[PDB]
Write a protein that binds this DNA or RNA. Structure first.
Ligand code: FES
Ligand code: K
Ligand code: K
Ligand code: K
Ligand code: MG
Ligand code: MG
Ligand code: MG
Ligand code: MG
Ligand code: MG
Ligand code: MG
Ligand code: MG
Ligand code: MG
Ligand code: MG
Ligand code: ZN
Lengths: 95, 43, 162, 11, 82, 38, 175, 169, 222
RNA sequence: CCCAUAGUAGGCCUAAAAGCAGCCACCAAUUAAGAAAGCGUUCAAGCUCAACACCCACUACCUAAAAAAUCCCAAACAUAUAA
């Protein structure tokens, strides 16, 4: 539970857009599950997790807006859930 | 610094001895000779 | 393979993944029935640490080792190749594959000692101050015991301890 | 037999 | 000093009213309904020992739950000394 | 560290690692669990 | 935090053991006792009630009171003061499936079963399991004469148990 | 002058030691290692009765219930998840969970082949006998973190926006 | 899907009235006034007694020779009676009480003057004899821990085994002897007196077949 | 590795026994979880395990040391067809 231990205190908002009909959204959905885990959300009540289920067909994306005003974009077309979580934790620690 | 108490090859504690490949081969050769002797005495 | 690029564009970090060309196994293996690439190409018991052209196909660009599941090798061949790769790294047969160094860190000058068939790490073993008697001699290990089953054209078998 | 896929929201 | 209140000891009252159900001071004892007003499954409920694994149908969720509970008991017994 | 012949993990937090040619059972929650192979 | 405990209706007191917990967590013991008594005034005293206390960070408490315990329901229905010691062997009390169904109707109003929306058949099965754990045998039908005979037998058995307890106390005094 | 039985391993005569070395167990060695040879497959055990019951339940649910929707079961707290399940039960939306391994053959061999990509990861079904899409949608919106992965209404596959518009219809 | 499996039928076993091990005396009640020679052949060679299970399902098997005294008996009894379950497990001995007289001379005595006075008693044990046998409504995985502890603390080599483990060990030894690829064997050479090897071998080797050396038994010798 | 609601603090003793000081039972709710396997609390809370779910970890399945006194002790070698 590295993400839960680190917390979402410097994170203003997390948004995950993915098309369930596509097959590359597996890692994005795993990341969404990990972030939406009760412990991670309870670490920081201010942070809100938004889910965008669409049939547009665009590649899945994750946008994280931090309290410092910066943003982190992770495209799940060719990224894994572990890599996305590692980048998220690194950026949380940086901010 | 490496001492064997008393005489090397007699006593409670002895210098260890190890079997060599040529010794094994010689024993096998003699065993084969004696087996052939057994066969020729069989008749 | 797959590559990951991180770009901090306009105070907005973007992480992207791209797919690059990947090598494919050479056609017509001599032994299609084999369950590992080594036994498919009949390289079992027929390779050593100096076969860099074989070792480099199972290692990371920075000198690491690839997973057994990804490579498709069996446990025995995986361990043998890992030992051979360690020996090759210690012998300096893979200059292109070097450990990644953080920016601004320049290694200090160190003495150069050519070596080969290095089983243990250079900075782990202690000097043999007391060799002991002939019947209890402390031998210096040379090579890897896992390669004892390699083909030995010479009549004398490999001496794994000097 | 198999049901048709959901039409895209863009279309 | 704090114990349960006094319980009814009249057999007729116990067999004709739901003394245990009666819990409010203002509310009175609820008379027991007849078999016509009670459902059949209530009288079909098991009152003896739990049904054995052999009795339970092999494809029944009750059978699978019983097998899972037996496996949990076996694991607990194995790990008790461990 | 305490020298031992058979290294064992006194708790789940303990982890085994081979360093300097010897095995070590390291721990952080309970530092007294640290053990060195003899 | 959440504090779940069994509190008898109308018998809340500022003493131990619930009082120290409320004091440690910041809950006003006297205020909790007053509120519990006010909410359980309509309920007969001595009835055990499950109570869930939610403690907010500003040291304010919210109390939820559940339905009375099925053990107490069965004991009151069967006229039992103390349950069977060796359950499954000695029959402390005797109840009917009608009593079980009525207790299931009452207990179905509890939040735990209400949220799951489980059938009254499941509630009845749970009550049957509870009765088996208590030692009160459940029969399909019971008559007044049979219940009176069972009460006489249970009174004789309780007299024997009292004699055994007196003998054990005498042995302990001798020790 | 040691006796025949000693507390320590007595030193053997050299000829006896050579005899012991010669008469050593030589294990049989196959010409080709078995791991480097093809292994015939082993027939798996018969289908579990629980798996068969799950298949029957899935078939019955898909045949009877009209409103069928797939939602990624996010790791909510048990109390809040039970509360949401009770709220769904208020409008007869019975949340169902079945293993993906059991569910896949039914979808592959049934009319729901195109629904296969929607069942990757932790997923549950908000299925009701009658269409209550508006209530389902508002209950989904009550928890923004919990998403709605489209679904299929009355043998008609629809996306999340299709589910949104069906209630408006 | 998790593959549930049927539980064993351990519940069919009935526990006797006395599950725990009985007390073993230091010496027999009747003293022995006849001192005995140091017969070391009673712990030499394969065990000819108590080699099979009788009333239990697990046992402590001895892979070597030695003498068990009151300290070993107390260690075994205390460990088993402390780590066992009286309701589900029962244990019995397979070795008798110490009966063999052992003599010790006074400290500082020279050689000569006569055999010393009796000091204590021991129970001879050979390789292959069960020491303690357990059974009941349990499994070998629940007893192996303390049985292996006792075996390790025993004066000789010992191991916790069950019926299946012992049968598998015997079958593996038989298979090794059957499929051994070495054309020369100790038993054959000793029986045929090849190379005059009986000049250095022992008369007991004709039956031990090179598997026993004093009180030590080598399982790897085929 | 991920998660872990509930009849119920099952009765029995005990000032107190809440799964975890003792005795008996050891059923049952939820598709999914022992009237509790190992920690904890004076007792409760509080923690892992056996649960569900996701999902190829595709575990090795051999055990294991060392220290004396003048100064370690041949030098060396893993590769050319068993003699
Ligand atoms: S190379 Fe053949 S089994 Fe691995
Ligand atoms: K000597
Ligand atoms: K020993
Ligand atoms: K207790
Ligand atoms: Mg000498
Ligand atoms: Mg002699
Ligand atoms: Mg109680
Ligand atoms: Mg208890
Ligand atoms: Mg306790
Ligand atoms: Mg259950
Ligand atoms: Mg419980
Ligand atoms: Mg608890
Ligand atoms: Mg678990
Ligand atoms: Zn530790």
């Amino acid at each position: 539970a590295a993400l839960a231990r680190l917390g979402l205190r410097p994170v203003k908002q997390v948004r995950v857009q993915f098309c369930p009909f596509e097959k590359n959204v597996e890692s994005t959905r795993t990341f969404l599950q990990t972030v939406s885990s009760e412990k991670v959300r309870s670490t920081n009540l201010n942070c809100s997790v938004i889910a965008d289920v669409r049939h547009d067909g665009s590649e899945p994306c994750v946008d994280v807006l931090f309290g410092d005003g910066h943003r982190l974009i992770m495209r799940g077309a060719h990224l894994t859930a572990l890599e996305m979580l590692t980048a998220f934790a690194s950026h949380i620690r940086a901010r | 610094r490496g001492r064997i108490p008393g005489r090397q090859w007699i006593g409670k504690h002895r210098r260890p001895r190890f079997v060599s490949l040529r010794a094994k081969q010689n024993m096998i050769r003699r065993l084969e000779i004696e087996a052939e002797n057994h066969y020729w005495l069989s008749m | 393979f797959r590559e990951v690029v991180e770009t901090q564009e306009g105070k907005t970090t973007i992480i992207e993944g791209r797919i690059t060309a990947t090598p494919k196994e050479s056609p017509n293996p001599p032994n299609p029935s084999g369950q590992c690439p080594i036994c498919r190409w009949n390289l079992k018991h027929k390779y050593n640490y100096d076969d860099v052209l074989l070792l480099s196909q199972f290692i990371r660009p920075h000198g690491g080792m690839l997973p057994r599941k990804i490579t498709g090798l069996c446990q025995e061949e995986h361990r043998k190749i890992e030992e051979c790769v360690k020996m090759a790294h210690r012998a300096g047969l893979l200059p292109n594959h070097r450990p990644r160094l953080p920016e601004g860190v320049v290694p200090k000058s160190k003495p150069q000692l050519n070596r080969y068939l290095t089983r243990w790490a250079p900075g782990s073993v202690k000097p043999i101050y007391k060799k002991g008697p002939r019947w209890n001699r402390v031998r210096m290990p040379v090579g890897s015991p896992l390669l004892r089953d390699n083909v030995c054209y010479s009549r004398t078998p490999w001496k794994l301890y000097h | 037999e198999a049901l048709a896929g959901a039409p895209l929201d863009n279309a | 000093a704090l114990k349960d209140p006094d319980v009814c000891t009249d057999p007729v009252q116990l067999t004709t009213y739901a003394m245990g159900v009666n819990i409010y001071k203002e509310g009175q004892d609820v008379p027991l309904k007849p078999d016509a007003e009670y459902p059949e499954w209530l009288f079909e409920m098991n009152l003896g020992p739990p049904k054995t694994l052999e009795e339970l149908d092999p494809e029944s969720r009750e059978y699978w739950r019983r097998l899972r509970k037996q496996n949990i008991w076996r694991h607990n017994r194995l790990s008790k000394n461990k | 560290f305490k020298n031992k012949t058979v290294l064992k993990k006194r708790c789940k937090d303990c982890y085994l690692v081979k360093r300097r040619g010897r095995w070590y059972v390291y721990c952080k929650t309970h530092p007294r669990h640290k053990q060195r192979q003899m | 935090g959440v504090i779940r405990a069994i509190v008898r209706a109308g018998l809340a007191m500022p003493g131990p053991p619930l009082g120290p917990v409320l004091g440690q967590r910041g809950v006003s013991i006297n205020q909790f006792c007053k509120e519990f008594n006010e909410r359980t005034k309509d309920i007969k005293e001595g009835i055990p009630l499950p109570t869930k206390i939610l403690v907010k960070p500003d040291r304010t408490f919210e109390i939820k009171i559940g339905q009375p315990t099925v053990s107490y329901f069965l004991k009151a229905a069967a006229g039992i003061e103390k349950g069977a010691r060796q359950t499954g062997k000695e029959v402390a009390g005797l109840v009917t499936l009608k009593h079980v169904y009525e207790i299931a109707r009452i207990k179905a109003q509890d939040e735990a079963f209400a949220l799951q929306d489980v059938p009254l058949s499941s509630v009845v099965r749970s009550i049957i399991g509870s009765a088996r754990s208590l030692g009160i045998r459940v029969v399909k039908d019971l008559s007044s004469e049979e219940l009176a005979a069972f009460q006489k037998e249970r009174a004789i058995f309780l007299a024997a148990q009292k004699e055994a307890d007196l003998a054990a106390q005498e042995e302990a005094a001798k020790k | 002058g040691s006796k025949a039985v000693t507390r320590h391993r007595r030193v053997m005569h050299f000829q006896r030691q050579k005899l012991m070395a010669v008469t050593e167990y030589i294990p049989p060695k196959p010409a080709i290692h078995p791991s480097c040879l093809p292994s015939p497959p082993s027939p798996p055990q018969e289908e579990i009765g629980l798996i068969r019951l799950l298949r029957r339940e899935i078939a019955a649910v898909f045949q009877d219930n009209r409103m069928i929707a797939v939602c990624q079961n996010v790791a909510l707290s048990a109390e809040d998840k039970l509360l949401m399940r009770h709220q769904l039960r208020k409008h007869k939306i019975l949340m169902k969970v079945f293993p993906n391994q059991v569910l896949k053959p039914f979808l592959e061999d049934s009319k729901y082949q195109n629904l296969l990509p929607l069942f990757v990861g932790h997923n549950m079904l908000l299925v009701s006998e009658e269409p209550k899409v508006k209530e389902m949608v508002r209950i989904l919106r009550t928890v923004p973190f919990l998403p709605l992965l489209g679904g299929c209404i009355d043998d008609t596959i629809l996306s999340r926006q299709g589910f949104i518009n069906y209630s408006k219809l | 899907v998790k593959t549930l499996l049927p539980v064993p039928s351990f519940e069919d076993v009935s526990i006797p009235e006395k599950p725990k091990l009985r007390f073993i005396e230091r010496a027999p009640l009747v003293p022995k006034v006849r001192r005995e020679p140091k017969n070391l052949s009673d712990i030499r060679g394969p065990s000819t007694e108590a080699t099979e299970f009788t009333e239990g399902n697990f046992a402590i098997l001895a892979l070597g020779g030695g003498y068990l005294h009151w300290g070993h008996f107390e260690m075994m009894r205390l460990t088993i009676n402390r780590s066992m379950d009286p309701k589900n497990m029962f244990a019995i001995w397979r070795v008798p009480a110490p009966f063999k007289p052992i003599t010790r001379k006074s400290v500082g005595h020279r050689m000569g003057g006569g055999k010393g006075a009796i000091d204590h008693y021991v129970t001879p044990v050979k390789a292959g004899r069960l020491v303690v046998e357990m059974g009941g409504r349990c499994e070998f995985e629940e007893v192996q821990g303390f049985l292996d502890q006792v075996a390790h603390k025993l004066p000789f080599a010992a191991k916790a085994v069950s019926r299946g483990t012992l049968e598998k060990m015997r079958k593996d030894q038989e298979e090794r002897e059957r499929n051994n690829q070495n054309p020369w064997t100790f038993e054959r050479i000793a029986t045929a007196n090849m190379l005059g090897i009986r000049k250095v071998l022992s008369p007991y080797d004709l039956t031990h077949k090179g598997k026993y050396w004093g009180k030590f038994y080598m399982p790897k010798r085929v």
